[PDB]
From a paper:
The spike (S) protein of coronaviruses is responsible for interaction with cellular receptors and fusion with the target cell membrane. The spike (S) protein of SARS-CoV-2 has been observed in three distinct pre-fusion conformations: locked, closed and open. To overcome this challenge, based on the locked SARS-CoV-2 S-R/PP structure, we engineered cysteines residues replacing positions D427 and V987 to generate a new disulfide-stabilized S protein S-R/x3.
Consistent with the predicted effect of the engineered disulfide bond, 3D classification of S-R/x3 particles showed that the majority of the particles (76%) are in the locked conformation, while 23% of the particles are in the closed conformation. Further 3D classification after symmetry expansion revealed that locked S-R/x3 spike protomers adopt two distinct conformations that differ primarily at domain D, we will refer to these conformations as “locked-1” and “locked-2”. In the locked-1 conformation, residues 617–641 in domain D form a large loop, of which residues 632–641 can be clearly identified in the cryo-EM density while residues 619–631 are disordered and not resolved. The locked-1 and locked-2 conformations differ primarily at residues 617–641 within domain D, and this structural perturbation is associated with differences in the FPPR motif and in residues around 318–319 which are located in the junction region connecting domain C and D. In this interaction, R634 in domain D is sandwiched between F318 of the domain C/D junction region, and Y837 of the FPPR motif, bridging these three structural features. These interactions appear to be further stabilized by hydrophobic contacts between the aromatic sidechains of F318 and Y636 and the domain D hydrophobic core. It appears likely that this zip-locking interaction not only maintains residues 617–641 in a loop structure but also restrains motion of domain C relative to domain D. In the locked-1 structure, we and others observed a salt bridge between D614 and K854 within the FPPR motif. In all of these cases the construct used had a D at position 614 and the locked-1 conformation was observed.
Residue numbers in the entry:
A (entry chain A): 946 to 994
B (entry chain C): 305 to 618, 632 to 676, 689 to 749
C (entry chain C): 946 to 1141
D (entry chain B): 701 to 1141
Write the structure that this text describes.
Amino acid sequence: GKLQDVVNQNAQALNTLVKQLSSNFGAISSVLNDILSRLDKCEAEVQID
Amino acid sequence: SFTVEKGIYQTSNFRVQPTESIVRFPNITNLCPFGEVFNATRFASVYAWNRKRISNCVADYSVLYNSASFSTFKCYGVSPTKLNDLCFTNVYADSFVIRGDEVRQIAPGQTGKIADYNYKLPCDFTGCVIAWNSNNLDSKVGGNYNYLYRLFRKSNLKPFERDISTEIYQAGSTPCNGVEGFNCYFPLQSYGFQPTNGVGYQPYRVVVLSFELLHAPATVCGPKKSTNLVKNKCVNFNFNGLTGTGVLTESNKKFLPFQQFGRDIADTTDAVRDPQTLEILDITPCSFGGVSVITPGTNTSNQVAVLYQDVNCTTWRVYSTGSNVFQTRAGCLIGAEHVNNSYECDIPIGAGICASYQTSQSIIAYTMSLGAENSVAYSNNSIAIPTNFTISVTTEILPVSMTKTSVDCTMYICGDSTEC
Amino acid sequence: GKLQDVVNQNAQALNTLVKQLSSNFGAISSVLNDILSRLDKCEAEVQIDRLITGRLQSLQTYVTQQLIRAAEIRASANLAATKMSECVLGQSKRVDFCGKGYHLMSFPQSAPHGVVFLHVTYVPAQEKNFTTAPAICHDGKAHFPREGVFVSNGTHWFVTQRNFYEPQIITTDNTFVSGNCDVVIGIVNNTVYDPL
Amino acid sequence: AENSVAYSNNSIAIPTNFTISVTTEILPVSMTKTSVDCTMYICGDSTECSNLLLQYGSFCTQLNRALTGIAVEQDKNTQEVFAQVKQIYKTPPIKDFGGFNFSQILPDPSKPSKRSFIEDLLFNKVTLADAGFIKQYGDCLGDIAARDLICAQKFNGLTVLPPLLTDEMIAQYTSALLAGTITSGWTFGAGAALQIPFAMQMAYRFNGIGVTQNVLYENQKLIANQFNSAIGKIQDSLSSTASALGKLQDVVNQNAQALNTLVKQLSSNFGAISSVLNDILSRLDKCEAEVQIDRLITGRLQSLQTYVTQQLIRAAEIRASANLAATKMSECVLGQSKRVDFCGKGYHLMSFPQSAPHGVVFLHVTYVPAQEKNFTTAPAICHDGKAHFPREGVFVSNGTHWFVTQRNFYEPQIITTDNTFVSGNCDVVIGIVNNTVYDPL
Ligand SMILES: *[C@@H]1O[C@H](CO)[C@@H](O[C@@H]2O[C@H](CO)[C@@H](O)[C@H](O)[C@H]2NC(C)=O)[C@H](O)[C@H]1NC(C)=O
Ligand SMILES: *[C@@H]1O[C@H](CO)[C@@H](O[C@@H]2O[C@H](CO)[C@@H](O)[C@H](O)[C@H]2NC(C)=O)[C@H](O)[C@H]1NC(C)=O
Ligand SMILES: *[C@@H]1O[C@H](CO)[C@@H](O[C@@H]2O[C@H](CO)[C@@H](O)[C@H](O)[C@H]2NC(C)=O)[C@H](O)[C@H]1NC(C)=O
Ligand SMILES: *[C@@H]1O[C@H](CO)[C@@H](O[C@@H]2O[C@H](CO)[C@@H](O)[C@H](O)[C@H]2NC(C)=O)[C@H](O)[C@H]1NC(C)=O
Ligand SMILES: *[C@@H]1O[C@H](CO)[C@@H](O[C@@H]2O[C@H](CO)[C@@H](O)[C@H](O)[C@H]2NC(C)=O)[C@H](O)[C@H]1NC(C)=O
Ligand SMILES: *[C@@H]1O[C@H](CO)[C@@H](O[C@@H]2O[C@H](CO)[C@@H](O)[C@H](O)[C@H]2NC(C)=O)[C@H](O)[C@H]1NC(C)=O
Ligand SMILES: CCCCC/C=C\C/C=C/CCCCCCCC(=O)O
Ligand SMILES: *[C@@H]1O[C@H](CO)[C@@H](O)[C@H](O)[C@H]1NC(C)=O
Ligand SMILES: *[C@@H]1O[C@H](CO)[C@@H](O)[C@H](O)[C@H]1NC(C)=O
Ligand SMILES: *[C@@H]1O[C@H](CO)[C@@H](O)[C@H](O)[C@H]1NC(C)=O
Ligand SMILES: *[C@@H]1O[C@H](CO)[C@@H](O)[C@H](O)[C@H]1NC(C)=O
Ligand SMILES: *[C@@H]1O[C@H](CO)[C@@H](O)[C@H](O)[C@H]1NC(C)=O
Ligand SMILES: *[C@@H]1O[C@H](CO)[C@@H](O)[C@H](O)[C@H]1NC(C)=O
Ligand SMILES: *[C@@H]1O[C@H](CO)[C@@H](O)[C@H](O)[C@H]1NC(C)=O
Ligand SMILES: *[C@@H]1O[C@H](CO)[C@@H](O)[C@H](O)[C@H]1NC(C)=O
Ligand SMILES: *[C@@H]1O[C@H](CO)[C@@H](O)[C@H](O)[C@H]1NC(C)=O
Ligand SMILES: *[C@@H]1O[C@H](CO)[C@@H](O)[C@H](O)[C@H]1NC(C)=O
Ligand SMILES: *[C@@H]1O[C@H](CO)[C@@H](O)[C@H](O)[C@H]1NC(C)=O
């Protein structure tokens, strides 16, 4: 189990990093494409930042 | 805390406050053409909007208070309160006349006939939109039809693009072949401006001032006065609207004619071309150098020593000289008496120097001793053997664990708040 | 103080984490209730998002510091386990691993968040000078000590153990013979008693 | 290299000669101590920015607490590695060490800093970024044309603090260790320093690795010559290239790179309209400049926190290395280690410390068997129905006669009652052979 713990920890870290792409982080959406299709670069730059 | 334990503490770096303030603006005295722009007898149509360059003038804009009253005045990229303290690089006034209801369309990121087909603004637009009613001027009995707007276009305009073409618009499928008819419209239509219209159908004169700030040489300046230039002193400077604090020194840098500022890789301004005398001045922060405070306990005494790193003591950059000033290799120590003896370290200054509080009572600084200095009688035929021994019990203390901690996110971040 | 440092560090970290709830983090206030009583959810959501981001960051900073401190504590605990195995459960020949001197034994004692080892060690005390030789020539042969060293109090030559002065008369069983007595440098002349 | 080995149930290989090999192990001990001024990195010479930063005092206090802990840890690491011995022993004026030549690792009083020649080489290989700690304001003001990185660091609140122990003091500590381990051996680490001739104590060490002391006395000249040649080879190797000391240059480069990256990260907008405080304050009033300055403060605080986290991790690595260096100082300089490959390749004889920038260099003197020879062997010999086993040795034969020899050196001895011991009869043991055992009169 000591080596399986290493493997599982690495896989879990990568999967968590993938999962964390659904957060808005204060923007109006978590999707770049939705922001760019709903707003012009004018104020889309703020959300993308 | 109100009590400080014995030791050495890193305080803030040595700070120098600015002694005075200076302002350096270009040597120009003419007033900007407010009359030719705002007091113009004949404005342009929105579809063919008039762009005028403004250069080499002072933008007081308090001469407009006497007569001009502006229905809308919105500034993007700059606060209205700072316009008197800035210089503007390349200034253009775009003038035209529109309907009252269409003044809202003169803004970044707008849609409508004016925004799409006649006059388009960028969203990276630094400048001020000004609009005021002109019913008494641009409206006459029977309808003033001298002002035109484009009603039909195949595609939206690019920002600051002008389209004066009068080709027939093909709204339908069949070509028009240069003649009007069904689904074949003349693209331009005239405003019907009558003095008895509603305020949303009354003419409005619009001036859009476009400029950049604090990146290039400027010839349009605010009404600020100019102060004599002083060097080699920490000052508050205002160079062409760019404010800051620092020491101004002569420079060996050779600016190209189109450059006004120079920057680090951190984008902070190093060098500036003085707008009055065409010379390059390097700007340096006037706060520099580490400072450390050596103290015994505040319950023991209130005396402290100060170690000024990166100063030499052999007009110093120190808070107070006093006496007992001497130079170590860790910096200049002020407030500690040097002694020729060597003891075990109590407060490590650095670079082999330590300090202590000794008896009358004062802080002393010394070179720490590595230990008792001795030799050993080595020989090719002499040995040393023990005839006795001791049983010694020593103590070694080792941490094993620490406190186990759990955190409730919802309660630390959002304590007893449901919406949170 | 090594264990009090651990306790103080943990307490200080928790107290700092409590203190960091007074920061606006760019919002209009550091209090959720003030924001919610002054603004509707309409624009209160923005300020609350700012506060959430900031407090999450504070928590992440705390957890990172705790992980680093846990790594340090785990290193110390691994060392303590090694000392428990090699000095309490045995005798260590490693120098200065368990006390200063030649390690005899060790005793463990529990302490809050730690262990205290009482290392009992042997320290030579009263050294005395002697004249010495690597070997002695007896009958053209060279005699070397087995486990000891040749010493002399000026007149007679004895063989003694190394960490304690216990002189013994030179004897065939004390020494061993290898080769003649000219190649070795520093060799001296003495007799070797042969037991009957 | 791919090879085999001639294994057999009755064949042994024993060395008839040896070599004295001096190897080099380089270990980091400390790294650069760094202090950060938050108000000056984040809010350089801006008062309104400082007033806005005032509410992040807890964050900046914990940053500086972590960095102060790192600095104290570095000082402690150096203290544990180098200040193990409490007394400063001196080298004797006479260097009658039985033919051994330590002139190239002992200090000389010609140069000011009493460093050995090898220490001087180690100093010269690795190049320090700071090259001092006094960089006056006038100097940084005078070289604005030059893009000096230290001045750029110090103008943004990033200072490097000096180590407590200078290179002279660390060199003095190493000199004391050399004097103690040459004139006294391992006795000065276990208590009072007891003098002993160097040859007799290298023979003690030879006994420690399982070789009889008579070998050393019979080959003293050869051993001394081999040691001197190995020291000379180390000297030439150090004088040739600088890539050997890359482990310490990595520490120096990592610290410098971290500080320079932290300086470079001041050009980020962090969502504000500019990365410059002065541009924001000259273009907007405090009204909405406070928002942009808050964004910049948050971002720069985050950059500082990232720097401090990386520094804490690097400090943990350096502390592990320094603990290893202290263990090696205790177990190989202050004693003889029986742990395999802990101090050099081969059977460890002794070790010498040398100071290096931010580190230590151990010259491990080891015993390496050189010239192996094949022999036929037996676990035991049957003499009169009894079984004889060697006490500390092995039975060998050159084809005709049977001898008993020590294990790490071919020193055959005639079989004798004192060489062997008897236990049981000579049928249960397998591989036992027949031979006579001489009984002395
Ligand atoms: C700028 O000029 C080009 C060329 O006249 C325009 O692109 C054409 O638009 C018409 C619309 O029906 C198309 O039929 C052409 O095929 C296009 N040609 C090319 C090369 O793109 C373009 O619309 C104009 N852009 C603006 C803002 O006026
Ligand atoms: C070795 O040292 C011990 C003490 O460290 C000596 O024991 C002491 O001897 C004196 C004189 O007889 C007494 O007054 C003390 O009471 C003894 N102390 C203890 C703890 O026993 C001992 O005599 C020394 N032995 C030799 C051979 O020198
Ligand atoms: C130790 O004993 C041997 C033998 O008695 C000494 O060797 C003799 O030395 C003298 C003068 O050097 C010679 O005349 C003899 O021929 C030597 N005899 C033999 C058998 O070698 C030796 O000199 C003595 N060494 C010391 C330091 O006393
Ligand atoms: C053991 O090896 C050493 C060298 O590693 C041998 O010493 C060399 O012997 C040759 C021939 O006499 C000389 O040319 C060299 O000058 C010697 N080198 C050194 C450093 O001394 C030694 O002879 C070997 N001993 C045995 C028994 O084989
Ligand atoms: C030990 O080795 C050195 C050479 O590595 C011998 O030569 C001395 O080298 C140093 C510095 O290179 C000089 O200061 C000396 O002048 C050199 N000595 C001579 C006689 O030339 C040194 O002699 C050797 N030590 C002994 C005792 O032989
Ligand atoms: C080693 O010596 C013993 C005794 O001489 C040998 O044992 C004898 O072996 C022969 C043949 O196996 C028998 O006839 C004798 O009766 C044995 N005598 C005793 C006392 O046991 C033994 O064979 C020899 N082994 C080797 C390999 O030579
Ligand atoms: C009654 C049917 C409406 C259905 C449309 C639904 C979604 C699209 C929203 C479109 C914008 C509304 C018309 C505004 C016209 C521009 C006014 C201007 O010149 O500035
Ligand atoms: C006035 O303007 C000129 C540049 O045309 C410049 O040479 C001069 O220095 C300015 N006057 C002063 C007092 O700087
Ligand atoms: C603009 O016109 C009015 C009247 O014609 C006049 O009073 C005013 O001074 C003029 N303003 C400017 C800036 O010329
Ligand atoms: C400070 O000094 C006083 C003695 O006047 C003593 O009572 C007190 O315990 C000390 N406090 C600390 C923290 O040292
Ligand atoms: C400046 O400090 C250094 C030591 O840090 C010293 O050598 C030098 O003399 C000092 N400068 C002067 C003019 O004394
Ligand atoms: C210390 O020693 C120096 C010379 O070695 C001497 O000049 C100085 O007066 C001494 N100072 C004190 C306080 O003894
Ligand atoms: C041994 O000899 C040296 C010098 O001859 C002397 O300093 C030392 O004190 C002697 N040792 C003892 C225990 O007296
Ligand atoms: C040396 O020890 C022996 C035996 O105790 C004794 O006979 C002799 O007198 C001693 N000599 C000296 C100089 O102490
Ligand atoms: C030991 O040293 C002394 C003086 O240094 C010398 O006279 C003597 O010859 C040396 N003896 C040996 C065996 O080296
Ligand atoms: C010992 O025997 C093997 C094979 O019999 C041979 O390869 C090897 O070279 C021999 N060892 C030596 C030192 O010759
Ligand atoms: C083995 O060693 C002995 C003693 O040196 C010698 O008499 C004998 O000839 C040697 N035999 C062989 C095969 O080397
Ligand atoms: C050793 O090996 C050889 C061949 O593998 C075999 O003939 C012999 O019997 C073996 N001897 C012993 C004691 O195992």
